[PDB]
């Protein structure tokens, strides 16, 4: 049975609005949620993170790209609603008084896609992962205790003769080396910023369902929904309640997420291409030549012939009118599986749409991503992140008593105290609240404390912009005053 | 693009196989007839003789690398009973 | 043995008064906080005479009034402490300081704790402190190869080499006075005792420490960036 | 402020005690009644049982750290005869 009233939940985790409500009150609730999301410092941080080219011209940032993803998602949602209304299935599916929340949730999910990426993107995550992999060596805990354990932490070594504590070390060691943008985005929205969003809004940004501490093979019935980590170990309990609030089974997905994913796949191509022309790399004639060589008739021929700042404004429209109805029909056709949360495919994943998207992608890979500047920026970002982690390493070499004393107020740790004071207030408060709730008598306290210390370091590193991290890296290396 | 952790797991499996005195040969391409990408792996030894060879097809590379790593771990379990 | 010259006590006393008050004034001049916050923090961290006169007679000229009262309250106390315990100071065995339970200690501690709470915790001081540590460590690492040589090699390098280009340039980078001091110190040593290498190593390390400590902040910083090929 | 060498000596004594399979617990505060600063040290073992505990008062921290280091070395000599 399909009933969207069981999925669009307007309750909250704190000070939730209880009782009965009408359409107007629900709409006001979701407008308030939009008000909290739009006026957040995370968006203004998105304002100054690079997409492809270094920040100078009128090149695009994360924010302008998010503004295209939002538009595409809203247009697809409107097409779906119109097609459902035409077939007289809108009232039978429980969506009669929930169209506004539908569109608002899709738009806000599209706006929050890039909230949790670290500086420099794909090359920031790689650096963090390699650094922590060198420090922890998670591949040595997959089986019974060894004598050649390469871990550098005494408390995280698998010391044979104790099986209840080992399971926990394995989980922590595997989790700490799987930083991912979406899991950090969930953590940021819930724990670090404390925005208190509705359950549906939080579920709209849960893209993948694989736990970060997973070891082994995934079931054949979920191999696509579990291709990337979805959430960390510190949010597990939270996620559990989320499922109870949205009637989701284990490793399942919230319906509207599919739409958002689709949007992130269209814009991803076309926008990049345009910027290549604006930076004076090549021109329109070369665009058509490369497209024709790498190859369709309708869009390409209309764009090339009707053209003989206004070429792209004509090229987008045709692509949208060719792609959006296909996504709407794919959503409506497989609706029961999506509502169940077990659809193991994507909307746009053998039609001509795949061919056109692959054409755009391969042209972009051949003529844009191979430019020396992108490549140089990518290497520089990797080195900067590694250097920052090396600089902040001494905070992880302390002991439980020393770090605890350092948190409460020292005269014995000048360098460490200054480094700790350099961190932000919100991250330290999150650490304090996380550690306070732990039982202070179990033999599992040091493990959790080390996990939360590493989490604090990763939050600090990932909460920067490109320019801020770069400048701080040169300042801490005594290269500039 | 491909996620870093999947590549790290594949590299770890390759290193585990190589430390077992085996050779891993990797080849890849794209098949436009099936509209997918294909990866073939050929396991060998110190002498250079084929033992197990398999090819995988998929349209998304994240699933493809996971399948390859799973197969590599399965063979390692099979042939690590001894020899 | 282990005794002290009388007048030194007086000097020590001085280094203890100014140490507080001056720092506080500079905090206002760099636009960190203001007079009202000064009084609020002082009152919270706490006396009647100096503080009340300073705060009430005030309602560039506030500090000129605050100093004078503190001096007229502190200097006679130090003079009387010097005169009272004069035989012990003249003997050189007085195991205390002049200003070390009177109200003077309380006022000085008030100034010191306010300065620690509101001035030394600023991010800029902290950043400068880390940068200086790293610069000194880097300079020592750069000049390390001079300490890995041998007695014969360093002796030959001092008298004039073709076998040690990098080491010769590094040595020539040092100042003339320090090298002359090393030469005079080593010349007087007996060249036959089995203790010669020990003393020579000691004086080499002394030469390095004199060179490192004889710089200014800006000179050391600039030299550190130049030797690391970061700036031309 | 505290001189670096005194802190280094105190840290060396603490490390020597810790390598002896002992635990050193450090606490500090200020006593305005006596107008001084107080430091208490509590020695323990691998099980977490108190052995020796002492508190020192002084108005200058350089002397206080020297006294603490001297006491730590005295206990190390006492309990390093054996066990």
UniProtKB/Swiss-Prot annotation, chains B, D:
Chain coiled-coil ranges: none
Q: Which UniProt keywords are given for this protein, alphabetically ordered?
A: DNA replication, Early protein, Host-virus interaction
Q: Biological process (GO) annotations?
A: DNA replication
Q: Which InterPro entries match?
A: Phage_T7-like_1.2
Keyword Lipid biosynthesis assigned: no
Which purpose does this protein serve, as stated in its record?
Answer: Plays a role in increasing the intracellular pool of dGTP. Interacts with and inhibits host dGTPase/dgt. The complex made of the host dGTPase and gene 1.2 protein creates a GTP-binding site of high affinity. Subsequent binding of GTP to the enzyme-inhibitor complex inhibits its dissociation.
Q: How does it assemble?
A: Interacts with host dGTPase/dgt.
The name this protein carries in UniProt is Inhibitor of dGTPase
Origin species: Escherichia phage T7
Swiss-Prot record, chain C:
On the tree of life, the source organism's domain of life is Bacteria
Signal peptide range equals none
Quaternary structure annotation from Swiss-Prot or TrEMBL? Homotetramer.
Function of the protein: dGTPase preferentially hydrolyzes dGTP over the other canonical NTPs.
Instruction: Give the family per the record.
Output: Belongs to the dGTPase family. Type 1 subfamily.
- What name does this protein carry? Deoxyguanosinetriphosphate triphosphohydrolase
């Amino acid at each position: 049975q399909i009933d969207f009233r069981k999925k669009i939940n307007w309750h909250r985790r704190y000070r939730s609005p209880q009782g009965v409500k009408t359409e107007h009150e629900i709409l006001r609730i979701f407008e308030s949620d939009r008000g909290r999301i739009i006026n957040s410092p995370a968006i203004r941080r998105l304002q100054q993170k690079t997409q492809v080219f270094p920040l100078e011209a009128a090149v695009r940032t994360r924010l302008t790209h998010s503004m295209e993803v939002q538009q595409v998602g809203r247009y697809i949602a409107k097409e779906i609603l119109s097609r459902l209304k035409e077939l007289k299935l809108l009232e039978a599916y429980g969506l009669d008084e929930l169209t506004g929340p539908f569109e608002s949730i899709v738009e806000m999910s599209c706006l929050m896609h890039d909230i949790g990426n670290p500086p420099f993107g794909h090359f920031g995550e790689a650096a963090i992962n390699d650094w922590f992999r060198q420090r922890l060596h998670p591949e040595d805990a997959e089986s019974q205790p060894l004598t050649d354990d390469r871990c550098s932490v005494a408390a995280l070594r698998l010391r044979d003769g104790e099986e209840p504590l080992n399971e926990l070390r394995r989980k922590i060691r595997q989790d700490l080396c799987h930083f991912e943008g979406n899991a950090q985005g969930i953590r940021l929205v819930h724990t670090l910023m404390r925005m208190n969003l509705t359950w549906a809004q939080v579920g709209g940004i849960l893209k993948y369902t694989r736990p970060a501490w997973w070891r082994g093979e995934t079931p054949e019935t979920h191999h696509y929904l579990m291709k990337k980590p979805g959430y960390y170990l510190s949010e597990e309990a939270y996620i559990a309640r989320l499922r109870k609030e949205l009637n989701l089974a284990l490793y399942s997905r919230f319906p509207l997420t599919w739409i958002m994913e689709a949007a992130d796949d269209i814009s991803y191509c076309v926008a990049d291409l345009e910027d290549a022309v604006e930076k004076r790399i090549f021109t329109v004639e070369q665009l058509y030549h490369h497209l024709h060589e790498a190859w369709f008739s309708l869009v390409v021929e209309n764009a090339w012939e009707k053209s003989r700042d206004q070429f792209f404004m004509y090229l987008r429209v045709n692509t949208l009118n060719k792609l959006v109805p296909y996504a709407a029909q794919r959503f409506i056709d497989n609706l029961p599986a999506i509502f169940a949360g077990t659809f193991n495919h994507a909307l746009l994943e053998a039609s001509e749409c795949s061919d056109l998207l692959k054409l755009y992608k391969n042209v972009a890979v051949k003529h844009v991503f191979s430019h020396p500047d992108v490549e140089r920026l990518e290497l520089q970002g990797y080195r900067v992140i590694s250097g920052l982690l090396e600089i902040y390493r001494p905070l992880l070499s302390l002991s439980l008593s020393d770090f605890t004393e350092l948190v409460e107020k020292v005269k014995r740790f000048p360098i460490e105290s200054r480094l700790f004071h350099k961190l932000s207030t919100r991250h330290r408060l999150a650490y304090v609240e996380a550690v306070s709730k732990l039982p202070s008598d179990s033999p599992e306290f040091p493990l959790w404390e080390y996990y939360y210390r590493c989490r604090l370091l990763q939050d600090y590193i990932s909460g920067m912009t490109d320019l801020y991290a770069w400048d701080e890296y040169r300042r801490l290396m005594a290269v500039e005053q | 693009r491909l996620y870093s952790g999947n590549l790290a797991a594949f590299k770890a499996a390759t290193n585990k196989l190589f430390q077992l005195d085996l050779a891993v040969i990797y080849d890849d391409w794209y098949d436009a007839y099936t509209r997918k990408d294909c990866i073939r792996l050929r396991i060998e030894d110190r002498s250079g003789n084929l033992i197990d060879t398999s090819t995988f097809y998929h349209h998304d590379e994240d699933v493809l690398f996971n399948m390859c790593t799973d197969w590599l771990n399965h063979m390692y379990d099979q042939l690590k009973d001894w020899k």
